[PDB]
């Protein structure tokens, strides 16, 4: 239908907007601590600790299959990345601190992205 096509045009342009947002987000992770899923080879008990793993590679796969229907969903996964890290790793570690910095630098990007999503509808 025309209705379905228009629906998919918005989804596509959402996806274009999210791909940008996701790049700005990785750019704030120069150490690439969150680029890839935590290796179960190197940390074999990880899933005993973290129930829902997330990372940028995984988010990017979902994104390219247009699996993000709105910004709430995308933010949910981004927060998973941060919250998992600040749980699994202790306060005085390089990993925890990298997450706190991503959280803070990221929040700016998501503050404006939320406005662009509303207005562009
Ligand atoms: C995003 C995130 O939580 N990263 C974690 C992955 C595990 N490393 C520690 C590590 C490295 C190598 C071997 C055994 C443990 C850093 C913390
Ligand atoms: Na902890």
Q: Where are the domains of the chain?
A: 1-121
Task: Report which bound ligand comes closest to the CA of 84.
Answer: 1
Give the separation between CA 118 and CA 72, rounded to whole angstroms: 12
Q: Is the CB of 95 under 6 A from ligand 1?
A: yes
Give the separation between CA 20 and CA 22, rounded to whole angstroms: 5
**31 and 98 in contact (C-beta within 8 Å)?**
yes
Residue with tokens 């379905």: 4
| Residue 9, token pair as written in the block | 């045009």
Resolution (A): 2.3
Give the separation between CA 105 and CA 51, rounded to whole angstroms: 26
**49 and 88 in contact (C-beta within 8 Å)?**
yes
Give me the half-sphere count of Cα atoms (radius 13 Å) on the Cβ side of residue 37.
14
- Enter the CATH code of domain 1-121: 1.20.920.10
Give the separation between CA 43 and CA 30, rounded to whole angstroms: 22
Query: What was the experiment behind these coordinates?
Result: X-ray
**14 and 70 in contact (C-beta within 8 Å)?**
yes
Q: To test ligand 1's pocket by mutation, which of 52, 89, 92, 93 has the most ligand atoms within 8 angstroms of CB?
A: 89
């Amino acid at each position: 239908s025309m209705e379905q096509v228009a629906m998919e045009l918005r989804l596509t342009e959402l996806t274009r907007l999210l791909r940008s947002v996701l790049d700005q987000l990785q750019d704030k992770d120069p150490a690439r601590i969150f680029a890839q899923p935590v290796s179960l080879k190197e940390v074999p008990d990880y899933l005993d600790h973290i129930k829902h793993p997330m990372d940028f590679a995984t988010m990017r796969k979902r994104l390219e299959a247009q699996g993000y229907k709105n910004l709430h969903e995308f933010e949910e996964d981004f927060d998973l990345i941060i919250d998992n890290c600040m749980k699994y790793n202790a306060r005085d570690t390089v990993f925890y601190r990298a997450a706190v910095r991503l959280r803070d630098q990221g929040g700016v990007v998501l503050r404006q992205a939320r406005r662009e999503v509303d207005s562009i509808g």
